[PDB]
Design a protein around this ligand. Structure first.
Ligand code: ZN
Lengths: 205, 205
C-alpha cells in the first residue's frame, strides 16, 4: 500500500508505504526509492528517523530500538558507519568511530556508574592503545586485545596510590612486572593470574 | 468520623476512623483505642499495616513510606524497636537491631551493588566492630566510629592481594601501619590522609 505523491511512473515526493512484512515508511521518495528524510517503523518495534538514499539508511539518523537501546549518528547504505553514539539500555554510551556496524577506529565508552574509557577499537572491541578510568580513581593505560587488557600496560590503584607496570594477558597481570608505590619505591616481581606470586627485588627512590 | 463497632461507650471491635488531620485507620479497636491489627493511611502518603496496642504501633508492622522506603519489623509504642528490615529507596536493606527508631545493636547493611556490611550499631551509625565486604572482594575488618572506619582495622585490596593493618581516622588510613603483600612480605610505613607517605622498613616472610 502506498499513499502519497507520484511523478512519472514512480513514487516521487512524499508518501506513506506499508511493506509486505508490516513495516511502515513515511517520508521522502525519489524515483520509487526511499530517498531524503523519513521515519520507518519496523515489525520488531525498532524505529528509524533520519536520512535515506537509494532505499537505504544513509546520512544522519536515529534508531530507537525496542530493546531500549538507541543509536544517533551516521549511516552508509543501511549500516551505521562513521561517527555515532550508541546509548545502551542501562545508560552506557559509546561515542566514536563505526565501520560496517562495528565499533572500529577511535571511540569512548562512558559508563553510567562513572567509569570511562577511550581508545582504539576494531571488530567491535577494544584493540590497541586505550585508557580506562574508574570512578574511584583506578586507571589502566596500555594495550588492549579483544576488549581485554592485553600487552604492555600500567594499572594504578588509587586506594593504595600504587601502580603496576608490566604485561597483561587476557585482562590479567602476568609475568615479570614492576610495582611502584606512592613513595617512589618499586618492587620487581612475577605475577600469575593477576596475583603477585614472587617478589624478586626491592628498588629504591 | 467513625464507622464501626461500639461496645459500652467506646469504640470496640472493628471500624474505620477518619482523623482531624486527614489520616484514616481501619482495623481493630479496644476501649476506644487502636488495638489489634489495622492499616493506617497517613496524610503524607505513608501507610502502616500491622499491629497496634493502646493507640500506638506495637508488635509487627509494615510501614510503606511514600518516598519509596519500606520498614518491615517490630514496633514498641509508635517507634520501630527490636528486629526489623529497612529497604531503602534504591534497594539497600538494613537488617538487624533497632532501638527507639535508631539502628542500635547488631545489624547488616546489604547494598544493591553487591556490597555488604555487618557490625555493631549505635545512634543509627556503625559504632564498634564490623566487617565491610565489597563486591570485587575488597574487605575492611576492624573498628567503626560514626559510620566511618576509625580505630584499629585491616583493609584488604583484592586487586593487589595486599592488606593494610593499622589505624584509621575518619575512614582514612592514618599513622604507622603495616602493608602485607600476597607473598607474605610486609612494609612498615606511615600513612597520612589514607596515603602512604613514608616507608620505614621491609620485613621478610
Ligand atoms: Zn589496591
Amino acid at each position: 500500500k502506498y499513499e502519497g505523491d507520484w511523478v512519472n511512473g514512480k513514487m516521487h515526493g512524499h508518501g506513506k508505504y506499508i511493506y509486505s512484512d508490516g513495516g511502515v515508511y513515511e517520508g521522502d521518495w525519489i524515483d520509487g526509492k526511499m530517498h531524503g528524510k523519513g521515519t520507518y517503523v519496523f515489525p520488531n518495534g525498532n524505529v528509524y528517523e533520519g536520512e535515506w538514499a537509494h532505499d537505504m539508511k544513509d546520512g544522519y539518523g536515529v534508531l530507537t530500538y525496542q530493546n531500549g537501546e538507541k543509536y544517533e549518528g551516521y549511516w552508509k547504505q543501511d549500516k551505521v558507519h562513521g561517527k555515532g553514539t550508541l546509548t545502551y539500555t542501562r545508560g552506557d554510551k559509546y561515542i566514536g568511530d563505526w565501520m560496517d556496524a562495528k565499533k572500529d577506529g577511535e571511540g569512548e565508552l562512558i559508563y553510567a556508574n562513572g567509569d570511562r574509557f577511550k581508545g582504539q577499537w576494531a571488530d567491535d572491541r577494544a584493540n590497541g592503545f586505550g585508557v580506562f578510568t574508574y570512578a574511584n580513581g583506578n586507571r589502566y593505560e596500555g594495550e588492549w586485545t579483544d576488549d581485554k587488557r592485553h600487552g604492555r600496560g600500567v594499572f594504578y590503584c588509587a586506594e593504595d596510590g600504587s601502580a603496576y607496570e608490566g604485561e597483561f594477558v587476557g585482562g590479567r597481570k602476568e609475568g615479570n612486572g614492576i610495582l611502584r608505590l606512592a613513595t617512589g619505591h618499586q618492587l620487581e616481581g612475577t605475577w600469575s593470574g593477576g596475583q603477585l606470586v614472587r617478589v624478586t627485588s626491592f628498588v629504591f627512590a
